[PDB]
Design a protein around this ligand. Structure first.
Ligand code: ZN
Length: 180
């Protein structure tokens, strides 16, 4: 669909302080699929927005105390109902992959776009999430054709550190909706 100076035109915008420059002004070429839920296993909170913008209340839940120290973000969140929230312009570097490697290249934040699916490793994602992830990805392919050839899970670039998006992420279903 429509892109506007790094922003998905139809996304809900929640501009986060948590981004910086892609080194060398490099165009991203890798999509990294993640999952997230705050508190763990629970859906619907304002907590993901707060985490990715650096404003989470550490006392709001026991789990938040441990992650309040994190400086993280992602380009987009796709919620259970398909709502697309964007935090970081696609041309900028969001902080979503951490220590990672892809085809021999480290620091994957540099050249990837990170999209978060609200959910868990073992629960099915919703039809709305597959459709929306596809719409976002198709829009991305249009600007950054290399992404067609480079779609991966966080678990694939950070094995034995990360498990997201887990076995529950149906790559076949996702692929069927991409590049049409
Ligand atoms: Zn992840």
């Amino acid at each position: 669909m429509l892109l506007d100076e790094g922003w998905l035109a139809e996304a809900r915008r929640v501009p986060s302080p948590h981004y910086d420059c892609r080194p060398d002004d490099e165009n991203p070429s890798l999509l990294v699929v993640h999952n997230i839920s705050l508190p763990p296993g629970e859906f619907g909170g304002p907590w993901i927005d707060a985490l990715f913008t650096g404003t989470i209340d550490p006392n709001a839940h026991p789990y938040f105390a441990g992650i309040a120290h994190l400086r993280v973000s992602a380009h987009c969140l796709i919620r259970r109902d398909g709502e697309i929230v964007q935090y970081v312009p696609f041309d900028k570097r969001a902080w979503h992959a951490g220590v990672s490697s892809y085809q021999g290249r480290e620091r994957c934040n540099d050249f990837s776009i990170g999209i978060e699916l609200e959910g868990t490793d073992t629960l099915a994602y919703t039809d709305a999430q597959y459709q929306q992830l596809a719409a976002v990805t198709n829009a991305l392919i249009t600007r950054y054709p290399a992404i067609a050839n480079n779609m991966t899970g966080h678990c694939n670039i950070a094995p034995e550190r990360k498990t997201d998006p887990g076995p529950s992420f149906d790559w076949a279903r996702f692929r069927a909706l991409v590049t049409p």
